[PDB]
Amino acid sequence: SVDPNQYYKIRSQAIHQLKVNGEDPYPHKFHVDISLTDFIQKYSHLQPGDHLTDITLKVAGRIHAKRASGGKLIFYDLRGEGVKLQVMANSRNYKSEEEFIHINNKLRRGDIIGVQGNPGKTKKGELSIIPYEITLLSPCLHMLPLKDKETRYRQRYLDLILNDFVRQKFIIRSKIITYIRSFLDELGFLEIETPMMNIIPGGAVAKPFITYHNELDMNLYMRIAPELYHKMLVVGGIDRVYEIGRQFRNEGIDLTHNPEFTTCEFYMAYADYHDLMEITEKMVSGMVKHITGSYKVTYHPDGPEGQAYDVDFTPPFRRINMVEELEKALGMKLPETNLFETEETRKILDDICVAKAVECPPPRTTARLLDKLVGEFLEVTCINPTFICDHPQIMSPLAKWHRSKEGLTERFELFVMKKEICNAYTELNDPMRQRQLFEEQAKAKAAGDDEAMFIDENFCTALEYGLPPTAGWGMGIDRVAMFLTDSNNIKEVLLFPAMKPE
Amino acid sequence: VDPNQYYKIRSQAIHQLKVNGEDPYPHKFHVDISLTDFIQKYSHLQPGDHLTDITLKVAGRIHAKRASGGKLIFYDLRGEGVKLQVMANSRNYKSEEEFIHINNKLRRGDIIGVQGNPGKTKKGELSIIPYEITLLSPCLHMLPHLHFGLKDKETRYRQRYLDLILNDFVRQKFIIRSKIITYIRSFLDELGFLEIETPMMNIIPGGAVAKPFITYHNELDMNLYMRIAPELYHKMLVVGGIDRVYEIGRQFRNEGIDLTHNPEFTTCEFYMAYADYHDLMEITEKMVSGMVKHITGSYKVTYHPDGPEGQAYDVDFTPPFRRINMVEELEKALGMKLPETNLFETEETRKILDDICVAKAVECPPPRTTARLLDKLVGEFLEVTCINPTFICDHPQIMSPLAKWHRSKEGLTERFELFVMKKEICNAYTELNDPMRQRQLFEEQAKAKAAGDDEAMFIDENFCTALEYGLPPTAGWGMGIDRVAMFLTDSNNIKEVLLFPAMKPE
Ligand SMILES: NCCCC[C@H](N)C(=O)NS(=O)(=O)OC[C@H]1O[C@@H](n2cnc3c(N)ncnc32)[C@H](O)[C@@H]1O
Numbered sequence A: 001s002v003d004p005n006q007y008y009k010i011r012s013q014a015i016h017q018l019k020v021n022g023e024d025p026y027p028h029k030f031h032v033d034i035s036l037t038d039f040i041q042k043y044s045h046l047q048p049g050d051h052l053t054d055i056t057l058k059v060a061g062r063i064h065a066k067r068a069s070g071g072k073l074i075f076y077d078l079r080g081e082g083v084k085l086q087v088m089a090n091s092r093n094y095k096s097e098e099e100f101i102h103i104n105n106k107l108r109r110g111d112i113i114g115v116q117g118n119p120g121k122t123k124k125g126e127l128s129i130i131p132y133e134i135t136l137l138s139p140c141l142h143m144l145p146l147k148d149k150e151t152r153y154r155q156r157y158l159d160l161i162l163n164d165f166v167r168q169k170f171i172i173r174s175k176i177i178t179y180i181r182s183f184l185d186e187l188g189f190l191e192i193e194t195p196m197m198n199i200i201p202g203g204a205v206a207k208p209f210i211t212y213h214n215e216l217d218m219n220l221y222m223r224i225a226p227e228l229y230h231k232m233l234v235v236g237g238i239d240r241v242y243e244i245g246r247q248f249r250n251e252g253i254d255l256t257h258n259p260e261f262t263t264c265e266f267y268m269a270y271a272d273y274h275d276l277m278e279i280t281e282k283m284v285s286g287m288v289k290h291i292t293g294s295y296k297v298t299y300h301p302d303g304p305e306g307q308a309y310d311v312d313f314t315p316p317f318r319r320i321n322m323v324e325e326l327e328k329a330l331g332m333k334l335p336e337t338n339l340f341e342t343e344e345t346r347k348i349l350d351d352i353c354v355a356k357a358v359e360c361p362p363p364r365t366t367a368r369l370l371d372k373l374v375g376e377f378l379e380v381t382c383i384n385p386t387f388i389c390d391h392p393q394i395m396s397p398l399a400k401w402h403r404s405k406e407g408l409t410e411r412f413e414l415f416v417m418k419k420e421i422c423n424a425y426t427e428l429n430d431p432m433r434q435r436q437l438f439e440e441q442a443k444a445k446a447a448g449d450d451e452a453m454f455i456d457e458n459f460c461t462a463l464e465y466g467l468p469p470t471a472g473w474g475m476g477i478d479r480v481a482m483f484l485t486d487s488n489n490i491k492e493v494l495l496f497p498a499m500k501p502e
Numbered sequence B: 001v002d003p004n005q006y007y008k009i010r011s012q013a014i015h016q017l018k019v020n021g022e023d024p025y026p027h028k029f030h031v032d033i034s035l036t037d038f039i040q041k042y043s044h045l046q047p048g049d050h051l052t053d054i055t056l057k058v059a060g061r062i063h064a065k066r067a068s069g070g071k072l073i074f075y076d077l078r079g080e081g082v083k084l085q086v087m088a089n090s091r092n093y094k095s096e097e098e099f100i101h102i103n104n105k106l107r108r109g110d111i112i113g114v115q116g117n118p119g120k121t122k123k124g125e126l127s128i129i130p131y132e133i134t135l136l137s138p139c140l141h142m143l144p145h146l147h148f149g150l151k152d153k154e155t156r157y158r159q160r161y162l163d164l165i166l167n168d169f170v171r172q173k174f175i176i177r178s179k180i181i182t183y184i185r186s187f188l189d190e191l192g193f194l195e196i197e198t199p200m201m202n203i204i205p206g207g208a209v210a211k212p213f214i215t216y217h218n219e220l221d222m223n224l225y226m227r228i229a230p231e232l233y234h235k236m237l238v239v240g241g242i243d244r245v246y247e248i249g250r251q252f253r254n255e256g257i258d259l260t261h262n263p264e265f266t267t268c269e270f271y272m273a274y275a276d277y278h279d280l281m282e283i284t285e286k287m288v289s290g291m292v293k294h295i296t297g298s299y300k301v302t303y304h305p306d307g308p309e310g311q312a313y314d315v316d317f318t319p320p321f322r323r324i325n326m327v328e329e330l331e332k333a334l335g336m337k338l339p340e341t342n343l344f345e346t347e348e349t350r351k352i353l354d355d356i357c358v359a360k361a362v363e364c365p366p367p368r369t370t371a372r373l374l375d376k377l378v379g380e381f382l383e384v385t386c387i388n389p390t391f392i393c394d395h396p397q398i399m400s401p402l403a404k405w406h407r408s409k410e411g412l413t414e415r416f417e418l419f420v421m422k423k424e425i426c427n428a429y430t431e432l433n434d435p436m437r438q439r440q441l442f443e444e445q446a447k448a449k450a451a452g453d454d455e456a457m458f459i460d461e462n463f464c465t466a467l468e469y470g471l472p473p474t475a476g477w478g479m480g481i482d483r484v485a486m487f488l489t490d491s492n493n494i495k496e497v498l499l500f501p502a503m504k505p506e
């Protein structure tokens, strides 16, 4: 048995000699007549022993096995597109005996080859192609083995070659995105692109990446959300806009966070958050039914040997109000919602966290304590899709104030399998109120909150030209893909996930 | 009145409405019908008609406010790219007192809701005759006067929302942008391509010759580069056995702004196993000609290289596209023979090209590499003569370190660029898939980078290891979406087709 580095060195020398001899081991064009998939669909009815001499076809793929059965006969296990096809290299059937001997000497497991041959089926019932001629298209210079998660992510190409289920997760991911586009296109939304480099990042509470433009001699930030730009287009008269695109957040990596991820955001003039709850139910349950075939999905959050959950996407989804549900979950009344700005509320919330052992790193502000208490006591009860509604204004600096509950806003988040999938609200369109909330945010930054929003004057000026009553919405695409591919790790649904180095 | 005085006065008026509970920013106005549907449904009304039995709620932005005595006032209501006249009549309003109150309250630019009955003026103008108008969002700033409009480009580009409010041709350019992207997805989906997303933050940037943006990740404690192209990720997926992939997405290049460059821009890149670049010329001809025809109704498009006040040109997208070879057309344009193409990597050839650029007054800032000198000469002598869609083919290897060597012309590659209306649109080639020859070209590129070439590629060892597992013979393609939007909207400035283009600050 040879050694993988010794093998690489021998196979490199062999391919070099092919070059110096003029054997052209990286040819320019091979014309494929038919895919492997259609070859199987056309010919897998044949009878054992058959050999259709009147049909000549060219296929191509990757050798996954080379098994010899004699001096005149060699079997190649050809793979591609998710399927297999046996090449039955028989000397009698080949272009010549001299050329037959030579091509079989050349080929190894892993090479890309083109086969020109006839359909057939072995005595043992295996569908095959019987070649007149095989062409080496691209030799594989390394030894092919994949279970350990680290190698699959650093070398996704090996993962795709060896693990058929991986291609399917990314087909599902592609179907998610394509469904969303045609859902919103049908509603009249315009698909738009807005800057990913901003003088001032905003649209979310997140830590941004910073970079530098040499010619303009200015710092820029990668966007954390396109929200501010979308609301400026609504001011401009484009009543329905959406964007599926990459966001960037300088935050830690875990099972549901990657530093670059994909969201869909859309904005709808003359709608409120109640309208968006209906659209969300309709879109999300529709997507799940279209992709999986049912409203029910089985999710394994601790891998396959762990506990199974049945998540039920039948609309209408359950709704819970944040502050009232938290009171029921803690067993104690909280301050009146108009007192959430005060230091007494902050300390009251602080004490509750201490008593209930809910950790919260500094700064221990009212908004961050409430977040920690929600995740601990509410979010973990959201197995099926659940709307969590009416967030305190102090957590929602871009959301319009609630119609009848002072201190709250017209906001919702959708949770599925205890994880946040959507964030939405009636948009704050009062520019003076928006400017006050920015000033609060910039104070929360000066007082230790790495993720608090910057003041965006240019955005406040836009609101001064008149933003119609509007409602916007954001969905984390990667996370949806997780829950439709039974992946408990976001790295399963990212082709090349962010990794620590060597 | 002064524009700043107007802003101060209107802010104070609106603030007094809040303090008096007049709610100038109401939560919900339930619209019954869009303006577009209203226009279609009641365009069949006869002149002078006034439906007494149809009451509808619409909304929009007041574009103009014209009084006609104290009992009648017309509002020109805009939205969705269309216009609807509100014929506000005191006799039909909620009351004559409410009529005075709302007309004095409202100004040009306000967002209003309108509840009323369809009608048509004696002059034949489709109207709505309101029972009640509601302010939904006041416009606090004085809008550019209805006379001289909004024409100054600096203002349009910095306040794109203002541009959109006042210039309907702007909305049309971005509708055309959307259709371009949607057509490409349909074309490529139908051919079986899988739409993919590959990383925009890279340990090292690759896939192009460009200067990158650098950034930093705190938790992982490393520098990252914003991507200059997705190319290397795509070719690794073809090694992985996904024979057809594509991606329409942002690229980032830390280079100067001009009429055809923005620091961030959008490309479609696709890779197709078992194809070469001749196959991609046919595909490009079909996609692009079909795109123009489907979107504009014609294969002929009008082109003004010098603005609307100047010469108009008809540009024909009917395939086949003209095909020329780079080196020979360059030699033609110069009137002078360049060195044999197997000599394009020598220093003596770089010297000759440098001498020529000096002589022809083609500027090239340092580093004056063969590729950059060649790129400048092409831009000066060939790009300007590509009006109709044109394939420029068979670039020398030294400009194409990821492109496969030409199967019969030593020193050249199997590459083409599509040029339309004096602009580069596409870049494509048969993909280099010999990993030993790809490492060599990486090494030369690193040497140049040591000698201070901001744009030279890094040695990507992970990519080279990938090629050693076997990349099938493949062909790949990159198209500038912004650049297609330019030529399909007769725009000579890329800022016309980016919603928020990068600008130097105030
Ligand atoms: N005006 C309405 C608000 C719309 C969306 C708002 N601008 C916004 O960005 N909200 S968000 O909640 O911060 O992000 C949207 C979704 O992105 C997802 N998300 C957030 N951070 C990450 C990370 N880091 N990785 C993956 N997915 C993520 C998650 O599902 C969120 O619900």
Ligand SMILES: NCCCC[C@H](N)C(=O)NS(=O)(=O)OC[C@H]1O[C@@H](n2cnc3c(N)ncnc32)[C@H](O)[C@@H]1O
Pocket: B207, B208, B209, B228, B229, B230, B231, B253, B260, B261, B262, B263, B264, B265, B266, B267, B269, B402, B424, B425, B426, B427, B428, B429, B431, B476, B477, B478, B479, B480, B481, B482, B483
């Ligand atoms: N293997 C095939 C190569 C495919 C494309 C290759 N990876 C690449 O990046 N080529 S490129 O020419 O550098 O860019 C592709 C297109 O992007 C467009 N482009 C390039 N720079 C800019 C800038 N700065 N702004 C706008 N558009 C731009 C232009 O249409 C180019 O043809």
